Amino acid sequence: QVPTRKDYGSKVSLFSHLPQYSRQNSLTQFMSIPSSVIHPAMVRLGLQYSQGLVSGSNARCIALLRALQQVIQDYTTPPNEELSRDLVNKLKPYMSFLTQCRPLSASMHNAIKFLNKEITSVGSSKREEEAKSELRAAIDRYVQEKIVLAAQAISRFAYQKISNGDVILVYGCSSLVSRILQEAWTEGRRFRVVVVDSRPWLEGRHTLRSLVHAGVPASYLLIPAASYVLPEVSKVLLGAHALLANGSVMSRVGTAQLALVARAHNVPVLVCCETYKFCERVQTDAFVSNELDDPDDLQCKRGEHVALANWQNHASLRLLNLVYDVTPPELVDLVITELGMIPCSSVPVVLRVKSSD
């Protein structure tokens, strides 16, 4: 059986209901080396989630669908049982193990929902390997269109907005915004990018390398220098991880802050999100549902005087590094999807017209 991981450190009194684990210890210390309860591709996926090797919001969904292809390929049918019920009952502890490794992104939630809807609608007269081929082909078509065709459509719809001679501000690491910047630089736009990064992940270095390798002139700075440079910045690109029912933008933790400071400097912000990453779930703060990272990650070496080394010996000391927040929907201007340029109030509209209604 799969046990629960022990909560690490002293939690925030506002975040006592949310789990906070550590990357030092693993859950597979008390599991079999031939993976029998959990699928071996699923425990491989949980290891590359828990150690932080797959951090992008689209990369988690791609690796999730590849592991689901490896599970469905390694699926067998018992006697007098249907695939459309047994696969539903078997994939739930797999997703529970993946949730206990690392909290799921909403892209992965909608991927689980779409796969459950597809394996629910498999007919009883279909054979074993024929339904396996149908499910693998459905996953392949799904990842094919709703990654690369939506990415090309959002790239063209943002290419027809970015003009010549402007400056663009980005935050965090996202493959969609970086692909927009690369395909805007290659097709003829001449611009420079101000890259805003934040602690302790420091994931802005990835898109910094991606913009220098693409030939784009780049500028690198942090959250406090964004207030210094936004009087010169005319355009802000952002990478959204989830869009809610009210039009909120779930992204990295420095998103609503940067959008508020950009509106204070009259700089329009632009989030870029594909339509499968939407939510019928809604929240208004970063407190009722959020991911808790490592409390040992906030420490750094400024000289030889690391102060947060023995932070657990102080009883009145709390360590917190939030992953997700939400934006109020009156702060974000663009929502660039593959259907066209929509505002934030059109997210449940696109949910309705893409939910067969």
């Binding site: 009194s13 506002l14 975040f15 006592s16 209901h17 029912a245 009210n246 039009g247 019928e280 779930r281 809604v282 929240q283 208004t284 703060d285 407190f287 009722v288 549902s289 109020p328 929907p329 109030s345 449940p348 509209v349 309705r352």
Partner: protein, 318 residues
């Protein structure tokens, strides 16, 4: 015939005199009972004759209490249901009647589990050690709080709606469940608003703009919450949603006797004073952040889609 017109007249005078019954869900259940009783014991040849009959019977209930929009928009929802049944049977006497019976029965099945679904999705909006502020008395918001406190520890500021102190009952009914509640008046709203994290209120009628009328003084709470940038949570069912536009028709507020504000024993100064007691108020949709219904959380920029999915544009006059 006789019992039909007797119960119709009793319901009309009950809405004319006061608030009968007290719960709005109980009044909605009696509204569906009145509509199924008026369709089961009458005769019609065309469906449009029944449409005109339901319109003529609904005009009297609208003119009985214009501030009670629940009976009017429930009549309008049943009119759209009968219109959709006539549309799916148009592209017819007993089959249409049985379809109306099973549809109104399904509407009661959906209506009995509204507060249950609101309490089911109550968990995704409340965290531990949280300061909540409410106004007035409503069963939906107190059910929200008493389900959210089953796994979370937080605080609720029960601000009374004071033309008549009905929020004291909400404060007692929460303190019996142990929500660590605090009682104050309407004059301390902005004074305590600098420590309030979220605003969770109910409403009486959701308008077509996303605007809402509720217990009075909540527009002040919405202005103070917009000043202090806290999100507003409106836990409201899907039968308080009406297509009546705010400035389109008159009689928006409901006026009661001025005895609850200034008593009869005041003296000779009652002759030269004008004391008005609105028990409701207007709240614009830009002062609202999120609506909570039984089907999920919705934006004030999304009430028009529920208006299109629940109501027909040729029925807004009724």
């Amino acid at each position: 015939g006789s019992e039909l017109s007797e119960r119709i007249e009793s319901f009309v005078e009950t809405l004319k005199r006061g608030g009968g019954p007290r719960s709005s869900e109980e009044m909605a259940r009696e509204t569906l009972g009145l509509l199924r009783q008026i369709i089961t014991d009458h005769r019609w040849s065309n469906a449009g004759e029944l449409m005109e009959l339901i319109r003529r019977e609904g005009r009297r209930m609208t003119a009985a209490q214009p501030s009670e929009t629940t009976v009017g928009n429930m009549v309008r929802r049943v009119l759209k249901i009968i219109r959709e049944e006539y549309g799916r049977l148009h592209g017819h006497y007993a089959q249409l009647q049985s379809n109306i019976i099973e549809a109104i029965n399904e509407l009661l099945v959906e209506l009995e589990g509204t507060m249950e679904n609101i309490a089911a999705q109550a968990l995704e909006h409340i965290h531990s050690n949280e300061v909540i502020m409410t106004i007035g008395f409503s069963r939906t918001v107190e059910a929200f709080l008493k389900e959210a406190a089953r796994k979370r520890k937080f605080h609720v500021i029960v601000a009374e709606c004071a033309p008549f102190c009905q929020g004291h009952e909400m404060a007692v009914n929460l303190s019996k469940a142990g929500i660590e509640t605090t009682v104050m008046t309407d004059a301390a709203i902005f004074a305590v608003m600098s420590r309030v994290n979220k605003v969770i209120i109910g409403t009486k009628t959701i308008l077509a703009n996303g605007a809402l009328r509720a217990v009075t003084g909540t527009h002040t709470l919405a202005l103070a919450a917009k000043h202090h940038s806290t999100p507003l949570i409106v836990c409201a069912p899907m039968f308080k949603l009406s297509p009546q536009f705010p400035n389109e028709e008159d009689s928006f507020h409901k006026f009661v006797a001025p005895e609850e504000v200034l008593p009869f024993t005041e003296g000779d100064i009652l002759e030269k004073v004008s004391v008005h007691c609105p028990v409701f108020d207007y709240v614009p949709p830009e002062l609202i952040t999120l609506f909570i219904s039984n089907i999920g959380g919705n934006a004030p920029s999304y009430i028009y889609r529920l208006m299109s999915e629940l109501y027909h544009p040729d029925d807004h006059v009724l």
